[PDB]
């Protein structure tokens, strides 16, 4: 609706929740869309049932639920960027919606770690990859990008993070496994060699922040280049 | 609105396949919508490849595959629907499209039956549903079905005709498992009893056609009732 969509990128724990929280507090033109994984990462809603269980099922045995996992993050994503869109930043001079994460990291971060790491088969990734390509174009082009924020770090920052959030599932986390999702971050974010099925994504304008300096109470030259990366879109 | 969309219903192998087949030809206003599924089952496309891989693995084990099968086998369907909906019939005196089973179908026989069998334990089920209730919804005037035509087969004639198309993955068939698919046939589509969340498939009008009797060198009654039929659409 004339709304500017910005996704949140980068590693787990780098800080994205912490600093998409931040933004939306700077403005009423600036909402946010959470990432669902977050809000099943603990009446209650019939969704949170069904990520709460798929999410533990996950932890126990990543090879029998990754593709069913998958479907279910992406499908409550692209359900919760279209319901922002229809009512948030109702209405405004300069919306400007963010994104935690986008259908992008559901594919060419995560569900493409796990298959590479063999939690998905062939059949179940190319079923993925072919029920992505179309669940987004039918539920589509509403949410296409107009830029990526990257919330840049190296993958020791993050289990420090990780052991600073105080999360006990987490501790567990290797540090090879970060570096395995750092690593495609930055081929997709800093090298910008990772193409993907979408045209208009390859000339999608990215903003690479260093999230290393804790930024929490320190956060206003970050917010500059937002701010300074929102006028040239 | 304007290409009236009809479903042809029944259990495996009670004659669909045959009845389009042969109604195809009828009219240049006619035209047929197979499913994925029944044409799996014998360089492919990418759903080609991947539909008969799904099948086979759901054959080995379906409390693996159901999920996985039910959601690609609906996806398909509704891609395959969608197509013809959208570049056949293009402006013809009276179209009328045949849909070889229907989304509820793929939901309300199949799905529920694999969960009732345990093969798609409560939060697959849940998944299941949640995924294809708010999908069929988005685009929600388009697939809507005009009628449905019920092809009322017996297990053992089914049975027995399992027999006559010799498939051999197909031998494998139960006759039990044919039972509990024509007591859900009956039940939603003659009996009324089951419960959906598409309200108007209270409305909408059903034809049922007994076709235990052979019919490949005899459909005109059969015919002439689905005309009859249309003429009250
Ligand atoms: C946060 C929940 C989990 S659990 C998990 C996992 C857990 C245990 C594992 O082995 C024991 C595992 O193996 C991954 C090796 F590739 C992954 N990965 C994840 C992240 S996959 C993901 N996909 C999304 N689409 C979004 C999102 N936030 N995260
Ligand atoms: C980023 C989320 C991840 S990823 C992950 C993981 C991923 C890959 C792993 O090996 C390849 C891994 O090894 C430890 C699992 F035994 C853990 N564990 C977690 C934490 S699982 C979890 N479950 C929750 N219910 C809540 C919560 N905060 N975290
Ligand atoms: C060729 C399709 C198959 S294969 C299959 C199957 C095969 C072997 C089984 O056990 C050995 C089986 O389950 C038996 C115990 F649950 C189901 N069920 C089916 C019916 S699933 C289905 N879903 C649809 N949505 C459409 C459609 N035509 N068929
Ligand atoms: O500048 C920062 C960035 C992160 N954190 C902490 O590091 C953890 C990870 O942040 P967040 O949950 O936002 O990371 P995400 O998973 O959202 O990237 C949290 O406990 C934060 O409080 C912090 O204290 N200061
Ligand atoms: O009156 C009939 C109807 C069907 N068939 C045969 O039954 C087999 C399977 O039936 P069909 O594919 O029509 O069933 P569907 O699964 O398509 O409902 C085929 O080899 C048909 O030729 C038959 O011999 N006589």
Tied chains: 1, 2.
């Excluded at 800080?15 to 507090?25: A, P, R, Y």
């Excluded at 993070?161 to 090879?176: A, D, K, M, V």
Aim: net charge negative.
């Amino acid at each position: 609706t004339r709304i500017k969509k910005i996704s949140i990128e980068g590693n787990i724990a780098a800080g994205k929740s912490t600093f998409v929280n931040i933004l939306k507090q700077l403005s009423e033109d600036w909402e946010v869309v959470p990432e669902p994984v977050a809000r099943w990462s603990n009446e209650l809603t019939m969704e949170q049932k069904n990520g709460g269980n798929v999410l533990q099922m996950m932890y126990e045995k990543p090879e029998r639920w990754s593709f069913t996992f998958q479907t279910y993050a992406c499908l409550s994503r692209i359900r919760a960027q279209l319901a922002s869109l229809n009512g948030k930043l109702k209405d405004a001079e300069k919306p400007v919606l963010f994104f935690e994460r986008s259908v992008y990291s559901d594919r060419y971060i995560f569900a493409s770690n796990l298959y590479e790491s063999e939690s998905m088969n062939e059949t179940e990734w190319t079923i993925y990859q072919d029920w992505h390509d179309w669940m987004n174009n039918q539920f589509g082009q509403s949410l296409e990008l107009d830029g990526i924020i990257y919330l840049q770090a190296t993958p020791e920052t993050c289990l420090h993070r990780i052991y600073l959030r105080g999360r006990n599932e987490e501790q567990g986390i290797p540090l090879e496994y970060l570096e395995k999702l750092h690593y495609k971050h930055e081929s997709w974010l800093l090298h910008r060699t990772l193409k993907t099925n979408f045209d208009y994504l390859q000339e999608v304008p990215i903003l690479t922040l260093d999230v290393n300096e804790d930024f929490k109470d320190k956060y206003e030259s970050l917010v500059e280049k937002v701010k300074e990366f929102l006028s040239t879109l």
